[PDB]
Design a protein around this ligand. Structure first.
Ligand SMILES: Nc1ncnc2c1ncn2[C@@H]1O[C@H](COP(=O)(O)OP(=O)(O)OC[C@H]2O[C@H](O)[C@H](O)[C@@H]2O)[C@@H](O)[C@H]1O
Length: 160
């Protein structure tokens, strides 16, 4: 069974074996989690392009980086977005399992640039739990907002 912790910190300072980048399909660098990952592990972006709802892994700069492309909710219906967000997290979980990754730093996919201006913390978190429950990884969830930290902690606790 996996364990779940939440850290309010820059994901680039994570102490885990692997990190999930909240990526775009083209594998370009832009504002958010993507900028911090690009600065700390710059060569992790070579050939990282991958379709929406998929993940692509690389070892570079002494780190395992998992480029997960959540949907942009401005570009899909709510139902299509929900399906694609679930897919992105399952793709991440499959990479964790197949590669025997013991611990992973994960941000909440599609909750920033890709949120279509809605609060999607719980939508994204619940897909994170569903997908990563299929692993035995130690998952550390990273956010920047104190109010999110508390909501995520409450969500973790409720599963006990
Ligand atoms: N350094 C960080 N550490 C931890 N959490 C962070 C960091 N930066 C942002 N967050 C939080 O992590 C969450 C994810 O926000 P986002 O990074 O927008 O991911 P998306 O999937 O919504 O959009 C990805 C696009 O954004 C980029 O342009 C990429 O190039 C893509 O184009 C938010 O709640 C943030 O508060």
């Amino acid at each position: 069974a996996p364990s779940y912790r939440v850290r309010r910190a820059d994901i680039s300072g994570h102490g885990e074996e692997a990190v999930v980048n909240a990526a775009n399909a083209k594998g370009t660098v832009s504002d958010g989690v993507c900028r911090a990952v690009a600065k700390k592990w710059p060569s992790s972006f070579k050939g990282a392009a991958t379709p929406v709802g998929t993940a692509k892994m690389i070892r570079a700069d002494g780190m395992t980086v998992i480029h997960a492309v959540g949907p942009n909710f401005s570009t899909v219906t709510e139902a299509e977005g929900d399906r694609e967000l679930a897919a992105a997290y399952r793709a991440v979980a499959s990479i964790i399992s197949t590669n025997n990754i013991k611990s992973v730093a994960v941000p909440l996919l599609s909750t920033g640039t890709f949120s279509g201006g809605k609060d999607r913390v719980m939508q994204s978190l619940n897909h994170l739990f569903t997908a990563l429950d299929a692993t035995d990884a130690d998952v550390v969830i990273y956010c920047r907002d104190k109010n999110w930290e508390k909501k995520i902690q409450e969500a973790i606790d409720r599963r006990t």
